[PDB]
Amino acid sequence: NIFTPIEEALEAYKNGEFLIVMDDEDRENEGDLIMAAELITQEKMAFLVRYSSGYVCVPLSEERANQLELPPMLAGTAYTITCDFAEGTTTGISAHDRALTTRSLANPNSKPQDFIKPGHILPLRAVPGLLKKRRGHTEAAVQLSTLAGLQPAGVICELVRDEDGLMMRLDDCIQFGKKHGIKIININQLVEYIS
Amino acid sequence: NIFTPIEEALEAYKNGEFLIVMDDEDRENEGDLIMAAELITQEKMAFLVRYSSGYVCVPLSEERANQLELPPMLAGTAYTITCDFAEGTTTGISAHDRALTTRSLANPNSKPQDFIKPGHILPLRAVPGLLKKRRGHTEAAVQLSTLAGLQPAGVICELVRDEDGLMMRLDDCIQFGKKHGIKIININQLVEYIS
Ligand SMILES: O=C(CO)[C@H](O)[C@H](O)COP(=O)(O)O
Numbered sequence: 376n377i378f379t380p381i382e383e384a385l386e387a388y389k390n391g392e393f394l395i396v397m398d399d400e401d402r403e404n405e406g407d408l409i410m411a412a413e414l415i416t417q418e419k420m421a422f423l424v425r426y427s428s429g430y431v432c433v434p435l436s437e438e439r440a441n442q443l444e445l446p447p448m449l450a451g452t453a454y455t456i457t458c459d460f461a462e463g464t465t466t467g468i469s470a471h472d473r474a475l476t477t478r479s480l481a482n483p484n485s486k487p488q489d490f491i492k493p494g495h496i497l498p499l500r501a502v503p504g505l506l507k508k509r510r511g512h513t514e515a516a517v518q519l520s521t522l523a524g525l526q527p528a529g530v531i532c533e534l535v536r537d538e539d540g541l542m543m544r545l546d547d548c549i550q551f552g553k554k555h556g557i558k559i560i561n562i563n564q565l566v567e568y569i570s
Numbered sequence: 571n572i573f574t575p576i577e578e579a580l581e582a583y584k585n586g587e588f589l590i591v592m593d594d595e596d597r598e599n600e601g602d603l604i605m606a607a608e609l610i611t612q613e614k615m616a617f618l619v620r621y622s623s624g625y626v627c628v629p630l631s632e633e634r635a636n637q638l639e640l641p642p643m644l645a646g647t648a649y650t651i652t653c654d655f656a657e658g659t660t661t662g663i664s665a666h667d668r669a670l671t672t673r674s675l676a677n678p679n680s681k682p683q684d685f686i687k688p689g690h691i692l693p694l695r696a697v698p699g700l701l702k703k704r705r706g707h708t709e710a711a712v713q714l715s716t717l718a719g720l721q722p723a724g725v726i727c728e729l730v731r732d733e734d735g736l737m738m739r740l741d742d743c744i745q746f747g748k749k750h751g752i753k754i755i756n757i758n759q760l761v762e763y764i765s
């Protein structure tokens with residue numbers, strides 16, 4: 376009575392909804408909002424930023440990051456050099472611009488030269504094999520997109536409490552999901568489904 | 571009747587208050603919260619994240635960034651490789667951790683090896699000469715800290731509207747300052763003072 380079955384969650388994800396994603400069933404886990412990169416709108420980005428740390432990340436497969444010439448920031452969360460999609464952005468940081476950059480990272484027609492680096496989005500490199508190889512939120516995002524038949528790209532950020540800025544643990548995530556009509560899943564659940 | 575005189579603003583800054591900082595007097599300017607890096611607490615970081623884009627940046631002088639071995643992210647806003655202060659942080663992204671990292675970047679006793687890279691704070695390299703050479707929010711932050719007799723390090727983020735995630739222009743910044751008891755200045759004002 377807490378977690379949504381995966382096949383129902385995937386349909387929500389396919390229809391451009393966020394999912395609240397926990398590591399497993401533990402009450403002390405902190406929740407992330409995750410949705411498909413190609414489906415994030417200005418309004419949905421505004422929502423994500425409003426209720427999160429605002430350190431908005433875009434999980435991509437290593438292969439896709441390689442195609443887009445987004446190398447690891449250095450040579451643990453696998454940050455690439457940051458970026459903005461050049462055409463149609465100004466400040467880069469706005470909900471509109473962050474959403475556009477995120478959709479562009481998912482778009483299979485995007486080219487390396489279409490992006491300015493550094494920028495205001497944080498792409499992440501998901502390991503090949505995804506959740507079977509690393510049970511990270513990065514791998515979860517790309518896995519969800521893959522299972523949904525979408526481009527292997529997601530967008531994520533950590534839920535934070537309005538009251539005090541503490542990250543939302545399970546109880547608060549359940550409350551947030553109820554208030555905003557967002558389904559909750561956990562990574563263990565996803566691993567079980569694909570295994 | 572909008573902008574606080576610089577000497578009064580500096581005293582507020584010295585006492586660990588944020589300032590709302592605009593480029594000049596134009597009503598279309600978007601506002602940033604800026605405060606001294608060494609003075610930011612868990613609670614003040616929570617506040618900054620709550621009302622901003624959450625893409626929290628820490629302006630440092632080039633000399634200080636060089637000392638801390640924080641090279642430009644690539645070889646426009648001058649991002650360095652991101653970082654977390656290692657000791658006393660866990661997730662890096664929490665208000666507590668982001669605040670600690672920010673204070674640590676200001677601390678003249680901090681050493682390069684004290685930080686993990688990449689991380690969850692975005693240090694920025696302010697150009698030598700600060701606002702006399704580049705009228706950026708990066709240079710403004712380091713200038714304010716310098717004028718306040720503090721370490722040449724600040725912390726900044728863009729104010730965003732709760733309603734729709736649009737960046738706060740002047741009118742909304744005035745409202746925000748009144749609601750939260752935060753003074754407003756502009757960069758042109760600061761340039762005039764130092765010139
Ligand atoms: O959720 C997170 C860590 O709690 C962050 O969103 C991170 O950017 C990606 O997570 P991971 O390192 O688990 O892939």
Ligand SMILES: O=C(CO)[C@H](O)[C@H](O)COP(=O)(O)O
Pocket residue numbers: 602627646647648694705706707708709726727728
């Ligand atoms: O305020 C900003 C741009 O509007 C951002 O905070 C940026 O990180 C630093 O600004 P600048 O490039 O002006 O130094």
